[PDB]
Design a protein around this ligand. Structure first.
Ligand SMILES: Nc1nc2c(ncn2[C@@H]2O[C@H](COP(=O)(O)OP(=O)(O)NP(=O)(O)O)[C@@H](O)[C@H]2O)c(=O)[nH]1
Ligand SMILES: [Mg+2]
Length: 149
């Protein structure tokens, strides 16, 4: 029961901060409880601007809601990941991070959801800074990976 979740996306969106919420005080491992069953979750924060793609069980494509450029890069990023394992139904979620910065937002909630719906991904918004929805993010990953097994 081992789950490998890869954080990927443009520089500055919050990948390391997201990993930090899971790992506390570039790979983090913990046994967590999801749906009454314990599992080993390893969160990878080794994406650079590969080993990542083959290794992963799930891919969290992180963009920042305050960085429209990072959002525009999502389609081409997802395409490359999927193309590297064309036979696999990869669990993927688009993670709109920095939701706490309301007065700096460059990407809307509904836009994120439309993108995820169009590309057949999951979608969630997080604040890695305040641990808003970060637990839900990683637990959700475990659930989708389970469906692939
Ligand atoms: N307000 C706010 N700031 C955030 C949030 N997540 C990350 N940040 C801030 O955004 C900056 C970049 O975070 P970081 O996790 O380093 O991003 P990264 O994607 O790992 N960068 P890189 O790809 O270059 O390693 C940091 O200054 C961090 O404190 C968030 O949810 N809210
Ligand atoms: Mg980083």
């Amino acid at each position: 029961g081992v789950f490998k979740v890869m954080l990927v996306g443009e520089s500055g969106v919050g990948k390391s901060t997201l990993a930090g919420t899971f790992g506390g005080l570039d790979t983090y491992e913990r046994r967590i409880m999801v749906d009454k069953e314990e599992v080993t979750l390893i969160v990878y924060d080794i994406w650079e601007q590969d080993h990542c793609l083959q290794t992963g069980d799930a891919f969290l494509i992180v963009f920042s809601v305050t960085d429209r450029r990072s959002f525009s890069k999502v389609p081409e990023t997802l395409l490359r990941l999927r193309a590297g394992r064309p036979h696999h139904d990869l669990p993927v979620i688009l993670v709109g991070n920095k939701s706490d910065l309301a007065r700096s937002r460059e990407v809307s909630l509904e836009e994120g959801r439309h993108l995820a719906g169009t590309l057949s991904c999951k979608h969630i918004e997080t604040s890695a800074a305040l641990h808003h929805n970060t637990r839900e993010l990683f637990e959700g990953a475990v659930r989708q990976i389970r469906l692939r097994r």
